[model samples]
Structure formats: structure tokens, C-alpha cells
Target: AMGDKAKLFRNISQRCLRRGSPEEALRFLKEWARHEKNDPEPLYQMGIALANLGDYQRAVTVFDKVLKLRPNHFMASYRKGAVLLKIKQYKLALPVLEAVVAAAPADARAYYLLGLAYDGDEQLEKGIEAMQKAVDLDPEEIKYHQHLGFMNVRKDDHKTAAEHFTKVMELERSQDS
Candidate 1:
């Protein structure tokens, strides 16, 4: 029954998170963690709940715990990198995101975060390349195109910037209808 209860808690926590009720999710996540103290999934979910609730520092700490439990946990690694980027710790985010992209080259979000980290660290050209890669991988993602456009602007390539922005507008228009 303990295993079933833990599964229930995890399911409820996941539902709460998906519904944008992270405060409620945290309570269920706590129960899940209590039942499966050594499992990284509960901690990982807790980290996401903390992030959604804007407790980024606590989110980072929880994600760190998840990483300790499973060093090769790609989702935990990605979440840690994302939290680091959110807190503007670009230098700290760099290696984490780099590792993630290395392990999962097809992940567009990882490339997007990597691009942001590169730009924040003043590696403008490398940032543009990363952002461009993200766009190449997921051209329909508006944020990817938007960030690539911004990076081009920083590089004084207004022509490319305009092109990306135009694509962004096109995507938005399609989404609206």
C-alpha cells in the first residue's frame, strides 16, 4: 500500500503542476518525497513546482539533490541549467547547459538556453550560432526566432534580425487564427 500511496501522491502532484497550481503540487510532492526518499523523481517534481511558484533558489537546491541521486539525470540537469539562467548566473549555467546539449543534441530548449548563457557571458557570436541552431531545429517556436532576432541585433546584423522578427510575426498570426 505504501507504493500505491506514493504513486497516488506523485500523480496528484503532477496534475497540480500541469494545472498551474504549484502550491498544491508542493504538498503532494512532499508526501511523495517522504514515501520515496531515495528516488529522484519526487525531488525533480518538487524542483519544478518550486520553479513554477517563483522560488527559484529553492528550486535550484532541490534540483541539486536530484542530480546527486542520479548524476546522469538529463531532466534534472536541464532544469538546473534553466534555473541558473533564470537567476542570471550565466557563467554557472554554461557548463550545465553545455553538458545537456552534448547529451541531447536534438533538444531545442537546451540550445535556446545555451544561447542565452553564451550571450550573457559576452560570447555574442557563439550565442548567435546556438540560437540559430535552435531555430533550425524548431522553426515554428516563436521564442526561438525572437531570441535569434535579438542576438542578430546585438551583432549589428539588422537585416537578419528583421527577417527573424518577420518570421515571429508570421508565427503569431498563424497561432491567432
Candidate 2:
């Protein structure tokens, strides 16, 4: 019965989160987290809900708690890295996203975020490299191409920049069609 109660809370919290009602999700998550103090899942969900609610400071703290319990928790690391990026803490985001990219090389989104972290840290060449890798991994993603284009402009390679912007326009056209 006790496990059932926790499960019910978790299920409700998950549904709330999916429905974009993070405030409601947080309420249930608080109860679930109380039930499973040492289980990282509830805490992880709480971190997500907090982040969704734009509580980046608290979200990072909760994510840190999850990482403390399970150092190798992939989603926790990814979410923390993303939140760090949101807060413009590129220095803190770099290592976390780097680890994420290393763990899941096929993840285009991670590469995109890593590219952003690199750019924010003023490593334009590395940022361009990471953005290029993301585009290679998922060529149709317009945002990746757009960022690559912007980065190229910063590098003073207007010709290359124009090419990526052209790709972005093509992708957008296809998506609209």
C-alpha cells in the first residue's frame, strides 16, 4: 500500500509534467520524494518540474542532488547542463555537456547545447566544430544549421555562413510544406 501510494503520486506528477502543469507536478512530486527520499527518480522529476517552472537556481540544486545519488545518471546530467546553459553558466555547463556528448555521441541535441556552451565561453572555433558535428548528425534540424551559420559569420567566413543559412531556408520550406 505504501509503494502503491508512492507510485500513484509519481504517476500523477508525471502526467502533470507532460500536460505542462509543472506547478501541479511539483505538488505531487514533493509527496513522492518524501516517500522515496533516497530514490533519484522523484528528485529528478522535481528538478525537471522546477526547471519548467523557471526556477533555474532550485532546479540546478535538485539536479545536483540527483547526481550525488547516481553520478552516472544521464538525464540528470543532461538536464543540469541545459539549465546551466539557460542561466548562462557556460563554464559550469561545459564539462557536464562534454560528458553527455561523450556518453551519447549520436545525440544531436547534446551537441547543439555543447556548441552553445563553447560559443558562450568564447571558443568560437570549438563552437563551430561542435555545431558542424550536430549538423552532420542531423542535417535537417534548422536551428543547428542556423547556429552554424551565425558562428561562421562570427568567424568572418561569410561564404560558409551563407551556405548554412541557405540550408536553413530549405529546411524551413520543407517543414512548412
Candidate 3:
């Protein structure tokens, strides 16, 4: 496969990617995409490149295209909702992420993002509930515990937050050892 393609965008530098040079990647991806007529791969490529470039709005559009082509695409669904979250479009992110969670119940990060969307919507109880699920799915993941702790503090449940923070402290100490 190495010789089958130019190996162009695959090898680009992060420095270039961050500086809006995904335009270059898009150009090459387009050519590679031509062979994949009607495939969503190219659109997904564009979406990710745009997101990496901090062009969240364009990334949203590109992801929309991918979702249109493959309605049940997991990554496209998540990325589209994620871009909406990045732009503070919490209401829009809600249904999309909810669908993502329903489709992939085992993905802890989806529940975490769903928790974030709920927090953004001021649905504190629901936020804590979803974050609790995320923590339950992966007990040792410190970030999950930390986020649950933050949300509990927001809900004025200082006792629960303290327990979550204590877990985080223990996990961090274990990692250091």
C-alpha cells in the first residue's frame, strides 16, 4: 500500500497541521478520495483535518457530509457532536451525543461528553448521572473521576466531590509508583 499511494498527507508534520496546512492534506485526500467514489472516508479526512486546524465550523460541515453519506458512522457522529460541543452548541450536541451513547454504550468518553453537554445545558442532575456512568465504566481512569468530582462540586454535593477527588489522588499516587 505504501507504493500504491503517494504517502503524502499521512506523513505531514503536526506543526504544519496546526498552522492551517490541512488545506494541503485536503488537496491530496481529495485525489485519493476520487478512487473511493461515494465513500465517506474523504469527508471524514476533511472533517478531522479541519478540526485539527481549529476550523470547527468547517469541520462540522465536513462531518455533516460524512454523516449524510453514512448515517450510522460512529466516528462522524461523535466528531460532529464534539465540534458542536466545542462551539458551545450544547443543545445540538445533546441529541447527537445521546444517539452516539445509545449506539456505543461501552464508550466511556461518550458518556463523559454527554455529561459535559448536560452540564452546559444546566441539567446538573443528568450531568452527574452520566458522569457517574463514565466513572463506573472505567474506575481507574483519573480524568473520569476528576470530571465527576468537578460536576459534583457544581451540584453543591461537596461530600461526593471529596470522595471523587480522593480517588483521583489515590490513582495519581499509584501511577507515580
Candidate 4:
């Protein structure tokens, strides 16, 4: 029954994240962590929580532990990339997310985050490409459409931007039905 504590936290923490209370979730998650020093969730929350608190370097370390233990954790890869972006570590985040995008070419979330990282570095073309790839993979994701539209607007491509924004319009209609 001891293992249930960890599982319980995982479920609850996921809900907190979904509810936009990641910090509160992190507080609860700390208690759920197992005795294993290497359990990845606690370290991940440490990193993400630090990011939410505007503490970049320590957050980076927390993410480093997650990557150290599980190199193929793409979600962690995304989180790490986002933290790096927050700290203006554009060069570092780019390659990490580039690898992730390549590894998960069909994963809309990967491409979306990769695009944002690229955009943060002023790589608009690369950002647009990544964002569009995300839309291609997950057309139903309105956030992707919004991002794609924003990228187009940044490039002074109003016509294309309108097209992307139209996707959002389509989304509103879909939700109505």
C-alpha cells in the first residue's frame, strides 16, 4: 500500500496541473515522492515549480536530473526547453527541442514548443515552420492555429496570418456544435 501514495500523488498532481495550480500541485507532490532518491517526478516538479517561481538555474538542475535518469522523456525535454527559454538560454533550448521535434515529428506539442523556442530566438522562419508542422499534425489544436497566426503576423504576412486565424474561427464554430 505504500506504493499507492506515489500513484495517488501522480493522479492528483496531474489534476492540479490541468487546473492551473501547478504550484499547489507541486506542494502536494513533494509528499508523494517515494523514498527513492531518483524518482523523476519530484525532480521534474522541482524544476517546473522553480520555473513558475522565476528561478531558472535551479530549475535547470532539476530538469537535468530528469534528463539524466530518462534521456528519452520528451515531455521533460519540452519542460527543460521552456525553462531554458525563460532564462534566455535560446541556443541550448533550440538543439534540445530540435532533437525532440525530430524524434517525435508527429507530436504536435513537441513541434509547438519547438516553434516557440525558435521564435524566442528571433528565428521566425524556423518558428513558422515548426508551428505549421504542429498544426499539420494536430489541426484541432486552436492554440497551434493561434501561434501559427501570430508567427505569420510577426513576419508581416497578413494574408497567411488571416488564414491561420480563420482556423480559430473554425474552432469556435466547432465548439458551438
TM-score rank order:
2, 1, 3, 4
Q: For every model in order, what is the number of clashing pairs?
A: 0, 0, 0, 0
Give a tens-digit lDDT track for model 4, residues 28-129. 667666543578767777677778777788788878888899888777888888778767888799998887877877888888888888898899999998
Displacement of the residue 153 alpha carbon in candidate 1, Å = 1.8
lDDT of 2 by residue, 1-177 (tens): 358879999889878978889999999998998987888989998998899889999999999999999999999999999999999999999999999999999999999999999999999999998989999999988999999999999999999999999989998889979
CA displacement after TM-score superposition, residue 64 of candidate 2 (Å): 0.5
Per-residue lDDT tens digits for candidate 3, residues 35-55, read: 555677767887898887789
Local distance difference test, each candidate: 0.92, 0.94, 0.84, 0.83
Across 72-103, the per-residue lDDT of candidate 1 in tens digits comes to 99999898999899899999999999999999
- The prediction achieving the highest TM-score against the true structure is 2
TM-score of each: 0.86, 0.94, 0.85, 0.72
Q: Hey, what RMSD does candidate 4 come out at?
A: 4.1
Best by lDDT: 2
**Candidate 4: clashing pairs of residues:** none
Residue 32 of model 1, lDDT score: 92
* Candidate 3, poorest ten consecutive residues by summed lDDT: 1-10
Give the distance in Å from residue 172's predicted Cα in candidate 4 to where it truly belongs: 1.6
